Amino acid sequence: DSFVIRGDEVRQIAPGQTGKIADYNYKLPDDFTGCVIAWNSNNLDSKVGGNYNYLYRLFRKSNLKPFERDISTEIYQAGSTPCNGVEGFNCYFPLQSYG
Amino acid sequence: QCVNLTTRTQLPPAYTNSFTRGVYYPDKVFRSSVLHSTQDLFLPFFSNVTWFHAIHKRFDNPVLPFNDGVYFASTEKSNIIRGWIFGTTLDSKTQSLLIVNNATNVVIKVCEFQFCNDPFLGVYYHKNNKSWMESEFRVYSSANNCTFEYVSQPFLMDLGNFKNLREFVFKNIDGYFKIYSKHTPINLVRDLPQGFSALEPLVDLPIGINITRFQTLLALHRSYLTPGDSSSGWTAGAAAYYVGYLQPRTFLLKYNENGTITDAVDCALDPLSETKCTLKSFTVEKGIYQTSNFRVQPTESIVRFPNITNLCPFGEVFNATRFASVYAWNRKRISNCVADYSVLYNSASFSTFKCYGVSPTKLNDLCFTNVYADSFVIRGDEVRQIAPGQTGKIADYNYKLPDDFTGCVIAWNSNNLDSKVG
Amino acid sequence: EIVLTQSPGILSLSPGERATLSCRASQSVSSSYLAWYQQKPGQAPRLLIYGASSRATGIPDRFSGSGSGTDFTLTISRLEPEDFAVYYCQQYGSSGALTFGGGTKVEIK
Amino acid sequence: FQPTNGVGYQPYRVVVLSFELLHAPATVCGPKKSTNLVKNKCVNFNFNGLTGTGVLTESNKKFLPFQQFGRDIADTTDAVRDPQTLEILDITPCSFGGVSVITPGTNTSNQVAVLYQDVNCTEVPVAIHADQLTPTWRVYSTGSNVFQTRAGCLIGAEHVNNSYECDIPIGAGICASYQTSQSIIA
Amino acid sequence: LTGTGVLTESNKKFLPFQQFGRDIADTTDAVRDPQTLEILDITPCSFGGV
Amino acid sequence: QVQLVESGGGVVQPGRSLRLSCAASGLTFSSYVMHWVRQAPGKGLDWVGVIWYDGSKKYYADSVKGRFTISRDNSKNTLYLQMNSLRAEDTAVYYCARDPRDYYDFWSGYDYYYGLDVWGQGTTVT
Ligand SMILES: *[C@@H]1O[C@H](CO)[C@@H](O[C@@H]2O[C@H](CO)[C@@H](O[C@@H]3O[C@H](CO)[C@@H](O)[C@H](O)[C@@H]3O)[C@H](O)[C@H]2NC(C)=O)[C@H](O)[C@H]1NC(C)=O
Ligand SMILES: *[C@@H]1O[C@H](CO)[C@@H](O[C@@H]2O[C@H](CO)[C@@H](O)[C@H](O)[C@H]2NC(C)=O)[C@H](O)[C@H]1NC(C)=O
Ligand SMILES: *[C@@H]1O[C@H](CO)[C@@H](O)[C@H](O)[C@H]1NC(C)=O
Ligand SMILES: *[C@@H]1O[C@H](CO)[C@@H](O)[C@H](O)[C@H]1NC(C)=O
Ligand SMILES: *[C@@H]1O[C@H](CO)[C@@H](O)[C@H](O)[C@H]1NC(C)=O
Ligand SMILES: *[C@@H]1O[C@H](CO)[C@@H](O)[C@H](O)[C@H]1NC(C)=O
Ligand SMILES: *[C@@H]1O[C@H](CO)[C@@H](O)[C@H](O)[C@H]1NC(C)=O
Ligand SMILES: *[C@@H]1O[C@H](CO)[C@@H](O)[C@H](O)[C@H]1NC(C)=O
Ligand SMILES: *[C@@H]1O[C@H](CO)[C@@H](O)[C@H](O)[C@H]1NC(C)=O
Ligand SMILES: *[C@@H]1O[C@H](CO)[C@@H](O)[C@H](O)[C@H]1NC(C)=O
Ligand SMILES: *[C@@H]1O[C@H](CO)[C@@H](O)[C@H](O)[C@H]1NC(C)=O
Ligand SMILES: *[C@@H]1O[C@H](CO)[C@@H](O)[C@H](O)[C@H]1NC(C)=O
Ligand SMILES: *[C@@H]1O[C@H](CO)[C@@H](O)[C@H](O)[C@H]1NC(C)=O
């Protein structure tokens, strides 16, 4: 299971943790048997002037089931009014670039 | 392409009694002459299963909810039924699971599919030679972003008249799609037969997607007398398929000298069955017995917390311009608010988040009695000294936590604002 | 380019009566090529009968058709007020030309 | 602290949170959404930071001013006050005192009788939460063959005025046997 | 599977999906050889009735 | 609800160019043989041409020769037709109609012809 994050969420790749990656991007199960391998890629992944290819899911209306995948780009509703798929106030893409 | 087969109206759902059919093997371990007890999602015995058909001249294949798991079944000599589709929205906004079976192979694809209102598989026969069969897929309008693709040998399918029952339990646990199945002959019965049949594992697909609804796929022979677009012209044989729902239950399982499941006892089904669970033996002697009581299952969850709608006057303690020194650390009382940490995680990335006595996850579920936040600024190599039980300059001479400390430690980088040039 | 002929050109019958229609072809037809249409003035033609003696979807049972070889017939059981329009017959094959008939008209009396 | 300092030297802001856990009414709680209560129903409940499974029964137990919440003599939660409603609500298990199954040998037959111990017969369906139980269990819950004993309520056997020797010791002056067709007699 | 003991010839049938064999005590009593399809029964080294 | 939309009408200067196009609602436009029917002001219906599911075989009527070209665009859900000249045939109403005979129907040994089921709104060509 390969993915790119930034440093402070590396502690979140563990059974029973809370954060941006564990709650809305990639959740480990409680009975997980395996290994986690994380290494530096500032020479590889980082780009001069900013790199915006990698994306993380910021807002989602539930906590993840273990080992599942969701790439839906429906607009999050931070307000009572429906966004109707239109960007505006209290309406943002769930995905966001790391930079 | 799509054909809007239209059922003028859905016929009222028909309920048939499942006859203690559908118990799958829990794990790939050879067990012989040993009674094994397991608690897994299971079809309750004698449940009210569906009696949905295929051709009456309606083509009714409606979507049904996938709450926990579906026990599917099929009874036709010709293989009218082929595959299934699983998903939560089925309109190309989420990821859906496609299962389709043609004569040469079985294709399983996890993609964003725009399913038609009435999907089916088209079988076209050359005139005067049924041997020439050409198949056109009329299930998905389009496909996009396929993650998992799987191609393999066809599931056993019919090519001395006999009817072959095919049973398929679908389960979605921990992002794994488990399929269990077994095909048996049918002789002189119109509904789901009696006896016991055990389903053996066939695949374990790591689809990792949300499943809420499912729909049955039918292969319809094409009649050229009437046009293709009209519902007419897609005639096939009369096939009825069963759909059950899995509810968590505890079932004792009986193996045999050779290692195959022969009999099962569900504790919930009978008080006598519950006695068997306690004795751990199918045979029960004459007398009175006291049994462990687990026949009651939870049906709803209710949540009660006091009326506090106020976001916490943190005072932006996390965002405060100046923090306390470590020799004089500031303690702030927190009272009469609803603590939300989701905003704090969005506001800043925390390098160290270690909680003792309360888990970091499900911490938002729990209520906290009294909160005294203690804030200070240190250097990095001393951060590990904050944890209880470890010593140092800060732990011995500046700030000490007790051994029975119940709380959390949150440390984050501040070289951007707390560092001055010179 | 088959010479189709519709007779009679103009029919005058009261509503509720029975009207017969003819569409003769100059060459042999395999009895699966003709179609029958109703066209009200100012609107597009509408399918009634496809092939020979086969009713299209949405067409009521009052409309009927028959015929084989070079002689083909449309027979209506009862004439509705909304069924009064002009009618055309065609004939088509995969390599065959498509030729509509001159047309026939039913009229109030 | 200096701008170009090493990562160890760079300042790291530390905030430590200290919680006491359920010894007083809680002024601060998490973002869970409160829902209405369902009294006398087998549900999962999360009351003021304690999670459990059972039914909830109303009571009029008075409490000291400092702690509305109370603990039993075995330190089990005898009653926890509902947050929104000031009425005293105590946890009662879905499982009451353990039922006794009374059966002949499975070689002979499969008919069984159920004794609900120390429970009045009229209160038996409520005690076992029959509506929650399976329909086959529900037939055991309510029947014409209902006998009230000092031990409890026996359902599934017919009582006889004639006296026979004890085969199965029900208790409290009651015993069962299998006799003629063939059925469980008490 | 690491263990000490006796490897004996076995005639026990093995289903293809199943690779290991456990007794009524749930401990491992039979195994299939990785290279060849023969079934080997695991036997305690000392009966200990001594 | 199936609807075919006509366009490119109106009276123009007679000769050398005019544009017709027929749209189709839904996603069942492709793979269905389509024909163009021209309605004379007082002389009944007539034929223009036919195109198959992929356009490999095309055929035209004897009324006009060398002036009509038929093509289908799969992505735009619109079929395009062009007249290289405008003869004395004026005030002719042109319809686009869809015939359900799919590739599979003529692929099978069966020799069958269905009917022109759904028609367009119509247009004015002068
Ligand atoms: C898997 O998909 C299902 C949908 O098929 C998800 O369940 C749905 O979750 C949404 C919130 O994300 C629920 O919307 C909420 O509905 C309530 C009223 O019921 C409303 O008050 C809220 O404001 C909000 O609109 C939706 O009702 C719910 N539907 C079902 C079937 O329960 C489910 O969460 C997904 N599972 C995961 C974690 O992937
Ligand atoms: C059944 O469907 C599968 C998947 O579409 C077919 O397999 C491939 O089909 C494509 C065309 O759709 C070919 O270009 C590939 O070469 C096929 N690959 C294989 C492995 O055959 C399969 O041919 C279909 N079989 C039937 C009965 O039509
Ligand atoms: C099953 O269906 C029947 C008839 O609709 C109904 O009476 C019964 O309550 C249902 N539930 C059971 C017992 O499975
Ligand atoms: C039908 O097809 C099979 C296989 O293509 C062929 O062997 C047989 O001769 C055919 N029968 C006919 C053409 O009557
Ligand atoms: C398909 O994948 C891309 C990412 O490579 C993504 O941008 C797009 O949202 C996906 N398509 C959808 C959601 O339909
Ligand atoms: C075990 O399998 C053998 C061979 O199939 C068969 O003869 C025997 O009857 C089976 N016995 C049991 C207990 O199923
Ligand atoms: C903290 O301050 C920054 C600006 O320096 C602001 O962008 C961020 O939203 C604040 N977070 C909070 C509300 O604590
Ligand atoms: C809590 O607030 C709601 C309105 O949001 C109100 O209807 C309800 O009665 C209040 N309950 C209490 C504890 O007063
Ligand atoms: C009951 O036990 C007898 C032996 O005492 C045996 O022959 C018979 O088959 C058994 N019957 C059942 C139903 O178990
Ligand atoms: C409950 O049991 C007691 C003890 O025998 C009895 O006195 C009382 O009448 C019973 N009440 C009901 C309602 O059955
Ligand atoms: C058995 O005793 C009960 C006690 O009330 C009585 O009502 C019943 O009539 C008696 N039966 C006989 C046969 O004496
Ligand atoms: C492994 O390969 C070697 C060399 O081909 C062969 O001698 C040996 O028997 C093989 N092991 C197996 C599969 O039994
Ligand atoms: C029928 O199919 C068409 C596409 O050809 C679609 O636009 C329409 O919504 C469908 N109607 C029904 C009854 O599903």
Experimental method: cryo-EM
Rounded to whole angstroms, how far apart are CA atoms C33 and C17?
A: 29
State the chains in contact with D (3 or more Cβ–Cβ pairs under 8 Å).
B
- Total structural domains in chain F? 1
Domain that holds residue C10: 4-107
Q: Which residues pair with B177 in a beta bridge?
A: B172, B205
Contact indicator for B234, B80 with CB cutoff of 8 Å: no
Among D35, D44, D56, D51, which Cα is nearest to B304's? D35
Rounded to whole angstroms, how far apart are CA atoms C98 and F46?
A: 8
Burial class (CB in 10 A: 0-12, 13-18, 19+), D92: middle
Cβ within 8 Å, pair C47-F115: yes
- What DSSP line would sit under B179-235, residue for residue? EEEEEEEE-S-SSS--S--EEEEEEEE-------EEEEEEEEE--SSS-SSSSTT--
Q: How many CA atoms lie within 13 A of F99 on its CB side?
A: 28
Beta strands at B198-205 and B23-24: parallel, antiparallel or unpaired? parallel
* Other Cβ atoms within 10 Å of B15 Cβ, number: 10
Residue B23 has phi, psi (to 5 degrees) of -135, 125
Give the C-alpha distances (Å, rounded to integers) separating F28 from B8, B116, B196, E27, E46. 22, 11, 47, 62, 77
Among B218, B103, B216, B214, which Cα is nearest to B155's? B103
Q: Compute chain E's Rg from CA coordinates.
A: 12
CA D60 centroid distance within chain = 20
H or E segment to which residue C88 belongs? strand C86-91
Residue of chain A with shortest Cα separation from B350: A8
Contact indicator for A92, A76 with CB cutoff of 8 Å: yes
- What DSSP line would sit under B21-86, residue for residue? --EE-SSS-B--S-EEEEEEEEPPTT-EEE---SB---B----EE-SSEEEEEEE-SS--EEEEEE
Residue B82 has phi, psi (to 5 degrees) of -135, -60
CA E36 centroid distance within chain = 15
Among E28, E18, E32, E41, which Cα is nearest to B27's? E18
Contact indicator for B82, B218 with CB cutoff of 8 Å: yes
Cβ within 8 Å, pair F104-B222: yes
- Pick among B369, B372, B416 to test the D interface (most D CBs inside 10 A): B369
Contact indicator for C93, F113 with CB cutoff of 8 Å: yes
Rounded to whole angstroms, how far apart are CA atoms D20 and B406?
A: 7
Residue F45 has phi, psi (to 5 degrees) of -85, 165
Per DSSP, A64 falls in state P
Contact indicator for B337, B359 with CB cutoff of 8 Å: no
* Ligand 5 atom with minimal separation from the B145 CA: 1
Among B323, B300, B305, B295, which Cα is nearest to B417's? B323
Q: Which residue precedes each gap in chain D (C to N above 2.5 Å)?
A: 180
Rounded to whole angstroms, how far apart are CA atoms C17 and C78?
A: 5
Residue of chain B with shortest Cα separation from A74: B93
What is the end-to-end Cα distance of chain F in Å, rounded?
Answer: 31
What is the end-to-end Cα distance of chain A in Å, rounded?
Answer: 22
The residue written with tokens 């015939």 in the block is: F99
Q: Does C47 touch chain F (CB under 8 A)?
A: yes
By most ligand atoms within 8 Å of CB, the mutation choice from B314, B347, B416 for ligand 7 is B347
* Other Cβ atoms within 10 Å of C62 Cβ, number: 11
For CA atoms F97, F102, F103, F107, the dihedral sign is negative
Q: Does ligand 12 lie within 6 Å of residue E35's CB atom?
A: yes
- E strand intervals along B234-282: 241-245, 247-254, 263-266
The residue written with tokens 């088959």 in the block is: C2
For CA atoms E3, E7, E12, E18, the dihedral sign is positive
Beta strands at D100-103 and E28-32: parallel, antiparallel or unpaired? unpaired
Among F39, E1, B383, B95, which Cα is nearest to D9's? B383
C-alpha B129 to ligand 4 mean position (Å): 6
- E strand intervals along chain D: 11-18, 28-29, 43-47, 50-59, 80-81, 88-92, 100-103, 113-117, 146-148, 152-155, 168-171, 174-179, 183-185
Structure tokens at D39: 């009294």
Between vectors from CA B255 to CA B254 and to CA B258, what angle results, nearest 5°? 160
Query: How would you classify residue B152: left for phi > 0, otherwise alpha for psi between -120 and 50, otherwise beta?
Result: beta
Q: Does ligand 4 lie within 6 Å of residue B129's CB atom?
A: yes
Q: Please state whether at least 3 CB pairs lie below 8 Å between chains F and D.
A: no
Please name the member of A7, A16, A67 whose beta carbon is closest to the beta carbon of B359: A16
C-alpha B345 to ligand 7 mean position (Å): 11
CB crowding C19-47: b at 16 or more within 10 Å, else e: bebbbbbeeebeebbbbbbbbeeeebbbb
Q: Does ligand 6 lie within 6 Å of residue B17's CB atom?
A: no
The residue written with tokens 């001479």 in the block is: B397
Q: Where are the alpha helices (DSSP H) in D24-169?
A: 124-128, 135-141
State the chains in contact with F (3 or more Cβ–Cβ pairs under 8 Å).
B, C
Contact indicator for B219, B123 with CB cutoff of 8 Å: yes
What is the number of the ligand closest to the CA of B123? 2
**What count of residues does chain F have?**
126
What is the end-to-end Cα distance of chain C in Å, rounded?
Answer: 35
Upstream peptide bond of B306 is cis (omega within 30 degrees of 0): no
Q: Please state whether at least 3 CB pairs lie below 8 Å between chains B and D.
A: yes
The alpha carbon of residue B199 is apart from the nearest alpha carbon of chain E, in Å, by 13
Give me the CATH number covering residue F42.
2.60.40.10
Give the C-alpha distances (Å, rounded to integers) separating B245 from B20, B86, B125, B199, F25. 13, 15, 37, 16, 39
Using DSSP's 3-state secondary structure scheme, residue F122 falls into coil
What is the end-to-end Cα distance of chain B in Å, rounded?
Answer: 72
Among C94, F20, C51, which Cα is nearest to B227's? C51
C-alpha B346 to ligand 7 mean position (Å): 10
Structure tokens at A88: 């505006």
The alpha carbon of residue B230 is apart from the nearest alpha carbon of chain C, in Å, by 8
- What DSSP line would sit under D140-151, residue for residue? HHS-S-EEE-SS
- Total structural domains in chain C? 1
The alpha carbon of residue B5 is apart from the nearest alpha carbon of chain A, in Å, by 30
C-alpha A62 to ligand 1 mean position (Å): 8
- What DSSP line would sit under C97-109, residue for residue? PP-----EEEE--
State the chains in contact with B (3 or more Cβ–Cβ pairs under 8 Å).
A, C, D, E, F
Rounded to whole angstroms, how far apart are CA atoms B12 and B34?
A: 45
Q: Does F31 touch chain B (CB under 8 A)?
A: yes
Residue of chain F with shortest Cα separation from B233: F105
Rounded to whole angstroms, how far apart are CA atoms B218 and B120?
A: 5
- Pick among E17, E20, E26 to test the B interface (most B CBs inside 10 A): E17
Q: Which residues pair with C98 in a beta bridge?
A: none
**What count of residues does chain C have?**
109
Beta strands at B337-338 and D28-29: parallel, antiparallel or unpaired? parallel
Q: Does B376 touch chain D (CB under 8 A)?
A: yes
Please name the member of F44, F114, F121 whose beta carbon is closest to the beta carbon of C88: F44
Cβ within 8 Å, pair A72-B208: no
The alpha carbon of residue B351 is apart from the nearest alpha carbon of chain A, in Å, by 5
Rounded to whole angstroms, how far apart are CA atoms C58 and C55?
A: 9
H or E segment to which residue C47 belongs? strand C46-50
Give me the CATH number covering residue B145.
2.60.120.960
* Other Cβ atoms within 10 Å of D103 Cβ, number: 26
CA dihedral B173, B177, B183, B184 (to 10 degrees): 10
Structure tokens at F105: 């129907």
Rounded to whole angstroms, how far apart are CA atoms D147 and D167?
A: 18
Q: Which residues pair with B213 in a beta bridge?
A: B65, B87
Q: How many CA atoms lie within 13 A of B153 on its CB side?
A: 3
CB crowding B239-269: b at 16 or more within 10 Å, else e: bbbbbbbbeebbbbbbbeeebebeebbbbbb
Å resolution of this model?
3.9
Cβ within 8 Å, pair B147-A69: yes
What single-letter amino acid sits at C21?
L
State the chains in contact with A (3 or more Cβ–Cβ pairs under 8 Å).
B
Please name the member of B28, B29, B34 whose beta carbon is closest to the beta carbon of E24: B34
What single-letter amino acid sits at C46?
R
Domain that holds residue B280: 15-290
Using DSSP's 3-state secondary structure scheme, residue D114 falls into strand
Among B299, B222, B242, B223, which Cα is nearest to B43's? B242
C-alpha B138 to ligand 13 mean position (Å): 14
Give me the CATH number covering residue C16.
2.60.40.10
Per DSSP, C55 falls in state B
What is the number of the ligand closest to the CA of B257? 6
H or E segment to which residue D63 belongs? none
Cβ within 8 Å, pair E20-B30: yes
Contact indicator for B199, B169 with CB cutoff of 8 Å: yes
Q: Does C57 touch chain B (CB under 8 A)?
A: yes
Rounded to whole angstroms, how far apart are CA atoms B255 and B246?
A: 22
Beta strands at B64-65 and B213-221: parallel, antiparallel or unpaired? antiparallel
Structure tokens at B173: 């646990």
Rounded to whole angstroms, how far apart are CA atoms F63 and F80?
A: 20
Rounded to whole angstroms, how far apart are CA atoms B236 and B257?
A: 44
The alpha carbon of residue C100 is apart from the nearest alpha carbon of chain F, in Å, by 6
CA C47 centroid distance within chain = 10
Nearest CA to ligand 12 atom 6: E35
Rounded to whole angstroms, how far apart are CA atoms B309 and D166?
A: 65
Rounded to whole angstroms, how far apart are CA atoms E27 and E11?
A: 19
Among B25, B85, B20, which Cα is nearest to B244's? B20
Rounded to whole angstroms, how far apart are CA atoms D117 and B173?
A: 40
Burial class (CB in 10 A: 0-12, 13-18, 19+), D45: buried
Using DSSP's 3-state secondary structure scheme, residue D121 falls into helix
Per DSSP, F4 falls in state B
Q: How many CA atoms lie within 13 A of D125 on its CB side?
A: 11
C-alpha B171 to ligand 2 mean position (Å): 28
